[PDB]
Amino acid sequence: LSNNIEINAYIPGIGHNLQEHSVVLVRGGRVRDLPGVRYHIVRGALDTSGVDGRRQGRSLYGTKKPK
Amino acid sequence: ARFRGSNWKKSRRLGISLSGTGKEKRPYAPGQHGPNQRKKLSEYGLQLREKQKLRYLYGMTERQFRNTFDIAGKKFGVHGENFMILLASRLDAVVYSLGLARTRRQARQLVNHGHILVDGKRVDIPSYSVKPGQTISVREKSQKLNIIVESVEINNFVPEYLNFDADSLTGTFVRLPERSELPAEINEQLIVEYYSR
Amino acid sequence: AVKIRLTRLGSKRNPFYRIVVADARSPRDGRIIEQIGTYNPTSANAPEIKVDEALALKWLNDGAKPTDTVHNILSKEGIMKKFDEQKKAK
Amino acid sequence: NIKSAIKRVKTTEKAEARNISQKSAMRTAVKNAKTAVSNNADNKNELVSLAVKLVDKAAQSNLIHSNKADRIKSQLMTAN
RNA sequence: GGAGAGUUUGAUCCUGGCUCAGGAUGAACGCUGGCGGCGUGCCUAAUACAUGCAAGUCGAGCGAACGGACGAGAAGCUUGCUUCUCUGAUGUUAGCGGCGGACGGGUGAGUAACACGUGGAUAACCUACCUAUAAGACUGGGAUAACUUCGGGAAACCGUAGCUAAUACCGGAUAAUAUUUUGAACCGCAUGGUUCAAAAGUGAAAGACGGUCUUGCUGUCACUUAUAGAUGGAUCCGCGCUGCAUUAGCUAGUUGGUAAGGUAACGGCUUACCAAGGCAACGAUGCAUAGCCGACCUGAGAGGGUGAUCGGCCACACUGGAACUGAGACACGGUCCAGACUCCUACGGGAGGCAGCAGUAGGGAAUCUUCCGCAAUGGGCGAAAGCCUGACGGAGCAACGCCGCGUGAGUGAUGAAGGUCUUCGGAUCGUAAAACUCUGUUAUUAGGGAAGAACAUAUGUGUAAGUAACUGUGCACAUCUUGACGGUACCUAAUCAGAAAGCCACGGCUAACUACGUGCCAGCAGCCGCGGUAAUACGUAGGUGGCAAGCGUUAUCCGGAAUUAUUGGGCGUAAAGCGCGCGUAGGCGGUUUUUUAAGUCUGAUGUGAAAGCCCACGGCUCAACCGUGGAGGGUCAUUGGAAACUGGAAAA
Known part of the structure; x- marks a missing residue:
């Protein structure tokens, strides 16, 4: 992170636009898949690009309106 | 989004006449799965x-509806009554409840227009x-267009806490009403419980 | 260094000045000693004012350079007629 | 930066020189006075009354102001 | 004024935790987007900063230069040029000197304590300006900047030799409660205080502008001394004010005394001596964290959390230290020193300090214009006009929030087309559309309004205090004259339904169902849990509910939580009674009588700033908002009453 610590994150959604070395924003939220994660990134505000395979919860997963 | 809806389908859901507009298909309920159990x-x-059944009446929204509800939270005597009368002591109501329309919305576009004159004064x-x-009153300039005196002529009704002068189009508010003076009567207790949780 | 003076209190466009005694060192819109009277340059022309005019003379008798915008209205109420009618009395 | 106080600088320096001359002239007068207490002629009254004039010739301007002057007179007009 | 719902098991009741629903943010992020009113906007790096302004003013105190209106003598004759002489109005600003720069604006690194709040005290204090009063306002002198002239200096700036003034500076005279010393009375909270009598002690601008004009007289302002008043400041005190005891001894100028000195004043504030006390389980100390308060959020209420904007107090100004001027500073745009940093240099040496307004980089998830104006209010100087005012008025950017209007309304069935589904008849979107008939809030145009916010000071009239004399002065009426915002808001007429709608969710908790794809894969998840070919929980469609120019998620706080339980809990077995005893400190205490009045109750006086909250009212078209006025609030001080109870004293 900015503060120079080390944590884990599950990315949500279909497709992931990311790789090694890539900047990305972070929220919090825990999932019960396991510990070793209690966060998850957000889709669309920075390098993690919005996936437009959705139309229903477009307000999330980085999507913008189709027409 | 004060009003851009069909507003009939709502009254098809609830089991009340208005609004709107008009009066078969009402025994059903809306939607594909609608007609069934x-x-x-x-x-x-x-x-x-009950709440929506009073909300779509005046076409209004919730953040206004609450603020009304808790300015009834100040004054003495019972509560729900005061919410009703203060909700129907409004400008749309005193228009249509005086008989200058066929529905409640006709009064709203009548008054955004500015056609009426609260104490002889423009208000939108x-x-x-x-x-x-x-x-x-009615902005005497405009007391003769198609809509108004088309509506003024029929005596839809009159409550005794309103006076009226069909020749003058002049109403004047008279007494503090109650539901027993205001048709389209309700239950109050159920709706006041809703703003507990 | 003590000057009855004005402390505007309204919001954006409809100001409602207050007459008040104070030492000039202070900010305007801050601290005071005692309110007296008031002012309202609109909602009626001529303005709507009150005045103590009982103890408002107290502060003059023991020291003040009352400003002109005030001096005008104190004349409009005329309490200064009593003020000089004691000061230039003797 | 500097705008106008440069006036008050020069003034501050003038009044520096003046004021210290007044004070230190007094202080030496007091030294004479207290040292005249040991003595036996007078040789005291001239000096002590003089200095007790000087306290006031120099107190009206500087920061002393009166109370401390009056303490100096209080102790010094008594020791002789 | 107060709500419960799920979840351990094959099924049950309990104890018990976790999660959800609500409200709120100085808020960011995703989606989306019409407008106005109001209010807000570096919470992080007290990190560094280019460029602009942010504090000057008085010629009616002073010397000195510029200036040239007007008047005029000769003229080279080009008969208005001009040489000088010049008469000198109006004005200016370099300088001296007086008052302000310490207020005002900005931030919260430090600070765990009289820093802050609240209530008190000062027989331990100070106080320019402004008021009121009383008295004075005499007599002398010597210099010096600007200005001339020299030199060193790259520059910064420095010195040399003359010369000039003042409300400048320096002596003398005179001057009372002001200091010492003496005595009488009076007074009290202790040191002490108030008044009277007598010996020594200090000042001032002969000033400026004006009228009468005798230049006398006297006026306005100004100066000095003194006594008050008020204002501002200071110190001391009782009380309340954070977490750890896996922080239990600390302290030697410490604690007390004597003397001296010091300070506005008291004081170990500081020196020299005598002394060994002082503080602490009622939590000393040390440790990490932090500006506080009024207030804000929440909660039915007791209570819990925070200290944004607004206002009060405090500390700080690159870090650190010291002191001058001064009424006040140990000084936010002042100095001097040392230091780090940046910069100029002829290398000798010099310059600077945005946590002022804007703005830039930097960090950060994230926080704007290098705006117009001094009309108003408040400041500072002045005799006033007037000048300066990035305070402030007020425009601009941000859906950041609160409030408000609308994106049309009435009639319109055919259940049209068209979508989806169909148990393939039909149902559904659906008066919804289409169409008909009105409107134009709002917007497009054009006019008016350029509304208020403006009261003013100076300028003429008359009127009272005082003067020998409104001649002149010090005061209430009257007219003249002043808008950055803004050609605004608002108003008036015309034009078109044409520009102006989305987000989330649909197993239950929770209002809100059907088809496809998918097949323990992609995926969701706040909980319980879905998903292995027919998923109401995944992704797609349609429809529906909620919600609205706003909506969802994340982080934080309170609620629900009776899950620190004083209101309001429990210990046989569910977590939980030490293994038991002796006894200190502390907490609790049998009965009757008498008294006391600390506790208690009651009444009053003061205070508890204002704004805010809540109630009533009035205005902005209503609301938000603003104001008014009310009630309200203390473990608060002072004081008069009651005695049953707790308490103290006494008797039984």
């Missing part, structure tokens, strides 16, 4: 259904709170 009713659905907002010791 559906869920039961929780207590929540009852107080809620239906959210005014009408009071006694007043008149109400």
Whole structure:
């Protein structure tokens, strides 16, 4: 992170636009898949690009309106 | 989004006439799954259904509806009554409840227009709170267009806490009403419980 | 260094000045000693004012350079007629 | 930066020189006075009354102001 | 004024935790987007900063230069040029000197304590300006900047030799409660205080502008001394004010005394001596964290959390230290020193300090214009006009929030087309559309309004205090004259339904269902849990509910939580009674009588700033908002009453 610590994150959604070395924003939220994660990134505000395979919860997963 | 809806389908859901507009298909309920059996009713659905059943009446929205509700939270005597009369002592109501329309919305586009004159004064907002010791009039310029005197002529009704002068188009508010003076009567207890949780 | 003076209190466009005694060192819109009277340059022309005119003379008798915008209205109420009618009395 | 106080600088320096001359002239007068207490002629009254004039010739301007002057007179007009 | 719902098991009741629903943010992020009113906007790096302004003013105190209106003598004759002489109005600003720069604006690194709040005290204090009063306002002198002239200096700036003034500076005279010393009375909270009598002690601008004009007289302002008043400041005190005891001894100028000195004043504030006390389980100390308060959020209420904007107090100004001027500073745009940093240099040496307004980089998830104006209010100087005012008025950017209007309304069935589904008849979107008939809030145009916010000071009239004399002065009426915002808001007429709607969710908790794809894969998840070919929980469609120019998620706080339980809990077995005893400190205490009045109750006086909250009212078209006025609030001080109870004293 900015503060120079080390944590884990599950990315949500279909497709992931990311790789090694890539900047990305972070929220919090825990999932019960396991510990070793209690966060998850957000889709669309920075390098993690919005996936437009959705139309229903477009307000999330980085999507913008189709027409 | 004060009003851009069909507003009939709502009254098809609830089981009331208005609004709107007009009066077969009402025995049903909306939607594909509409006509059939559906869920039961929780207590929540009852107080809620009551709420919307008063909300789409005046076409208004919730953040205004609450603020009304808790300015009734100040004054003495019972509560729900005061919410009703203060909700129907409004400008749309004193228009249509005087008989200058066929529905409640006709009054709203009548007053955004500015056609009426609260105490002989232009006002463009239906959210005014009408009071006694007043008149109400029609911008004498415009007391003869197609809509109005088409509507004025028939005596739809009159409550005794309103006076009226069909020759003058002059109403004037008279007494503090109650539901027993205001048709389209309700239950109050259920809706006041809704603003507990 | 003590000057009865004005402390505007209204919001954006409809100001409602207050007459008040104070030492000039202070900010205007801050601290005071005692309110007296008031002012309202609109909602009626001529303005709507009150005045103590009982103890308002107290502060003059023991020291003040009352400003002109005030001095005008104190004349409009005329309490200064009593003020000089004691000061230039003797 | 500097705008106008440069006036008050020069003034501050003038009044520096003046004021210290007044004070230190007094202080030496007091030294004479207290040292005259040991003595036996007078040789005291001239000096002590003189210095007790000087306290006031120099107190009206500087920061002393009176109370401390009056303490100096209080102790010094008594020791002789 | 207060709500419960799920979840351990094959099924049950309990104890018990976790999660959800609500409200709120100085808020960011995703989606989306019409407008106005109001209010807000570096919470992080007290990190560094280019460029602009942010504090000057008085010629009616002073010397000195510029200036040239007007008047005029000769003229080279080009008969208005001009040489000088010049008469000198109006004005200017370099300088001296007086008052302000310490207020005002900005931030919260430090600070765990009289820093802050609240209530008190000062027989331990100070106080320019402004008021009121009383008295004075005499007599002398010597210099010096600007200005001339020299030199060193790259520059910064420095010195040399003359010369000039003042409300400048320096002596003398005179001057009372002001200091010492003496005595009488009076007074009290202790040191002490108030008044009277007598010996020594200090000042001032002969000033400026004006009228009468005798230049006398006297006026306005100004100066000095003194006594008050008020204002501002200071110190001391009782009380309340954070977490750890896996922080239990600390302290030697410490604690007390004597003397001296010091300070506005008291004081170990500081020196020299005598002394060994002082503080602490009622939590000393040390440790990490932090500006506080009024207030804000929440909660039915007791209570819990925070200290944004607004206002009060405090500390700080690159870090650190010291002191001058001064009424006040140990000084936010002042100095001097040392230091780090940046910069100029002829290398000798010099310059600077945005946590002022804007703005830039930097960090950060994230926080704007290098704006117009001094009309108003308040400041500072002045005799006033007037000048300066990035305070402030007020425009601009941000859906950041609150409030408000609308994106049309009435009639319109055919259940049209068209979508989806169909148990393939039909149902559904659906008066919804289409169409008919009105409107134009709002917007497009054009006019008016350029509304208020403006009261003013100076300028003429008359009127009272005082003067020998409104001649002149010090005061209430009257007219003249002043808008950055803004050609605004608002108003008036015309034009078109044409520009102006989305987000989330649909197993239950929770209002809100059907088809496809998918097949323990992609995926969701706040909980319980879905998903292995027919998923109401995944992704797609349609429809529905909620919600609205706003909506969802994330982080934080309170609620629900009776899950620190004083209101309001429990210990046989569910977590939980030490293994038991002796006894200190502390907490609790049998009965009757008498008294006391600390506790208690009651009444009053003061205070508890204002704004805010809540109630009533009035205005902005209503609301938000603003104001008014009310009630309200203390473990608060002072004081008069009651005695049953707790308490103290006494008797039984």
